[PDB]
Design a protein around this ligand. Sequence first.
Ligand code: HEM
Ligand code: HEM
Ligand SMILES: Cc1cc(N)nc(CCCN2CCN(C)CC2)c1
Ligand SMILES: Cc1cc(N)nc(CCCN2CCN(C)CC2)c1
Ligand SMILES: C[C@H](O)[C@H](O)[C@H]1CNc2nc(N)[nH]c(=O)c2N1
Ligand SMILES: C[C@H](O)[C@H](O)[C@H]1CNc2nc(N)[nH]c(=O)c2N1
Ligand SMILES: [Cl-]
Ligand SMILES: [Cl-]
Ligand SMILES: [Gd]
Ligand SMILES: [Gd]
Ligand SMILES: [Zn+2]
Lengths: 402, 401
Amino acid sequence: FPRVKNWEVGSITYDTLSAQAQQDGPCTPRRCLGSLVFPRAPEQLLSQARDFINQYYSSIKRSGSQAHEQRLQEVEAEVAATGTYQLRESELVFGAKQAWRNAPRCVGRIQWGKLQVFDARDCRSAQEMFTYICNHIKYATNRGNLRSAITVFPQRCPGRGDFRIWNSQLVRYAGYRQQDGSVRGDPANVEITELCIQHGWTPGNGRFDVLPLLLQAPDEPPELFLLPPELVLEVPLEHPTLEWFAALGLRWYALPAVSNMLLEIGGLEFPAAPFSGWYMSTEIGTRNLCDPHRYNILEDVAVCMDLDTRTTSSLWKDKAAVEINVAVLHSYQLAKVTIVDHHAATASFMKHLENEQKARGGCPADWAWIVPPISGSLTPVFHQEMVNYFLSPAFRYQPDPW
Amino acid sequence: FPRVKNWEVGSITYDTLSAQAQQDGPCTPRRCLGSLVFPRPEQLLSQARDFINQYYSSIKRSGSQAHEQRLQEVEAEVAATGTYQLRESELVFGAKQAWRNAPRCVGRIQWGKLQVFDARDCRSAQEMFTYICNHIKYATNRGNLRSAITVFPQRCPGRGDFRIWNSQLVRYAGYRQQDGSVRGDPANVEITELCIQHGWTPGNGRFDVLPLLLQAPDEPPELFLLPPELVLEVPLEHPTLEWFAALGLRWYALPAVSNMLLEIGGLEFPAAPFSGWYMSTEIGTRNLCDPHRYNILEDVAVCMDLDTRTTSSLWKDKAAVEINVAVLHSYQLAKVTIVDHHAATASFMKHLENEQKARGGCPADWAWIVPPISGSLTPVFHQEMVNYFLSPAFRYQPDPW
Ligand code: HEM
Ligand code: HEM
Ligand SMILES: Cc1cc(N)nc(CCCN2CCN(C)CC2)c1
Ligand SMILES: Cc1cc(N)nc(CCCN2CCN(C)CC2)c1
Ligand SMILES: C[C@H](O)[C@H](O)[C@H]1CNc2nc(N)[nH]c(=O)c2N1
Ligand SMILES: C[C@H](O)[C@H](O)[C@H]1CNc2nc(N)[nH]c(=O)c2N1
Ligand SMILES: [Cl-]
Ligand SMILES: [Cl-]
Ligand SMILES: [Gd]
Ligand SMILES: [Gd]
Ligand SMILES: [Zn+2]
């Protein structure tokens, strides 16, 4: 079992939980590929099902009881009879929480037990799908006191196509290829913008235009649905002492809601199961606004700050990024929208690792995604060695449906 | 062949060089251990043969006379003596390759410019000290630093090793108290009490340069006191925060690692110090601000009158940036070579491109190439990397006590 050191304190633990990792990752003893963003039959369905059922019955202090073996035989009979099986409602709640608990690139997992699970497995159409989604956004936003939630749409099954949300998040800003070479709005979203237009959306031409939703019912082309503006809570960005910062016209939205990942529970697959929490400020301040391939505002802010941008050693990039993050935090706090800074988030992740060490003997964590993109070694996770592996239930990436 | 993408630009390459990985890393399909710092008879000919072909292809002299010739003498030298000796040029070439192959080094754009001091006829701790002193004075060069490595004799059976007990050639002391805690550098508490054990009269300050403990084969170590005028140091001030000078902070000019083992063509040099110049985050961010190092972050923030009562004021981030500003400013004012993390990472991206065309890839350790402040503001953050182990190499090694 791997030995893990914390270099700030001197602590040493052993991740015995990793030895239970079932699915494989991209590394070998030849070469480590940890830094890559996207690394990647009835009896095999059965073995995954059996394991998750074991997991659930372990969690309810009923391992090896009547009910436990009853459910095991029940599932196999249903796989033999139908090729698949159905989760009970409590099993679904537990599986959705474990999937979050198990996600190695999430720093906010101290919250994994507090998750509101909406069961939309009866969903019938794209129109019902949209109504479920609007209710999700409304509950999670909660006027700025954000609540963690996931809505689970019907599972993959033989004979019918998948439900899919084509959008990568429920809230995204348009990216319009410009007259010259530039992009207006969010360059990360040029493709989905083009698909929405191709599917009859009338584009805008601002930098923060909220995209419509493309929703796919089984064996249907996607359908366009506009989000009511009063559903999408946004935060204008201002800076507590740089009064010109407001004149940049920057905004960001309250709700981070990932909508293109696949939820896996006991071999069953839910290709449509959007989940949401609340932001950590560096995702907005550092990545979304300062990435050269995103809004790329860093130089314009530094010039406005009167910094000397002709030489790297003045650290003008670092200084302007810090104030952009201050602005994000101040603005969300002013608007009373939940937000966590990278210092508080990494410190609560440290409690999560200690909680998880006692509970399960380890915790899967992807160091490069856990450590914030600014001020890395100022946070305690920097000095924590970590073991990255795949547990199930899980949220996995999947191909775009176009 | 691993697909490698740059997410800033969208470019793709393939790492065909990863195929040659001699030693195996710590990762398995089951789990990744990339974030761990240190992981937990005639087959000398295989590694020697392979290194010789490496030398001769590099000089465009594969499959010719001198190449054929040199393959035989290494064959006969081992047959007679059980080991072999490197030609001076090969020792040079193998030292530059080990640097070139170091996955955690972001300064490798410089790998071709390395001064190799051959101390292989060393015979006592006294000779060591004079070698190490020539190196230090040459590498320091009055603040215009020059990369350098001194190579002491190769290990051989039945006889002890040459070992430098200090982790670097310049280290500040770390002193315990009537209450346990540390004055000076906490990273050096162990060697500090080793030096005191072997007779060094300890100082009282937070920046006392330690004495050297040099160890010739089969004789216990011997204290050596560096000439104070040979240890170039930079007092730390800030361009606009006039009180910063008063904090009394300093750092030394020469980063010179003296505890790693150099392996070339199957030969092992447990004592082979190498030196370059600092990247400024090493001093300003890790050495001065790590909680287990000098841990000065709150003291600077108090002096800047920052709100240390809430983490969301980002007072830690602001104080850290100014500490790095003070490091860069002080080193440049003193005309001592230093490079900031933006310049350094941008040169590394050029290194990657050079290495792609020349060797088909480059072993890089993402967690160590990305700087410890402002990570995603540098281009290496957005570059996928592949980590693997090529020879010649620098490796870590046990402590000689
Ligand atoms: C409640 C507060 C939460 C915080 C502060 C938080 C924070 C984060 C951050 C900073 C990342 C890295 C994302 C990036 O850099 O792009 C991440 C990734 C992730 N989070 Fe969390 N998260 C929260 C809630 C949730 C919830 C409720 C779920 C699922 C039920 C979840 C599942 C995931 C997954 C699957 C990823 C990796 C997906 C990806 O971005 O590639 N998170 N989280
Ligand atoms: C010339 C300017 C150089 C710069 C700016 C530089 C910079 C760095 C930095 C920032 C690290 C990260 C280590 C840490 O964060 O603790 C590193 C590691 C390393 N460097 Fe370089 N370096 C230089 C020259 C050299 C030379 C000349 C050699 C050997 C001949 C070398 C060999 C290594 C090795 C083996 C490591 C990883 C092992 C370790 O120290 O932990 N470097 N370097
Ligand atoms: C639920 C949740 C909360 C949070 N605070 N953050 C996230 C991640 C945002 C998605 N990321 C965007 C960039 N990248 C393409 C990977 C996907 C999710
Ligand atoms: C040659 C060189 C140049 C440079 N600029 N930096 C270094 C790294 C200094 C040692 N570090 C900190 C201690 N750590 C255990 C080993 C790595 C080396
Ligand atoms: C190439 C590199 O792995 C990539 O840019 C990663 C690095 N770490 C990250 N970490 C987080 N949290 N989010 C990211 O998007 C990334 N991107
Ligand atoms: C735990 C973690 O792997 C460890 O602190 C590493 C991370 N990255 C690093 N990167 C550099 N350059 N130097 C270091 O000492 C470390 N430490
Ligand atoms: Cl986002
Ligand atoms: Cl150092
Ligand atoms: Gd102002
Ligand atoms: Gd004052
Ligand atoms: Zn790995």
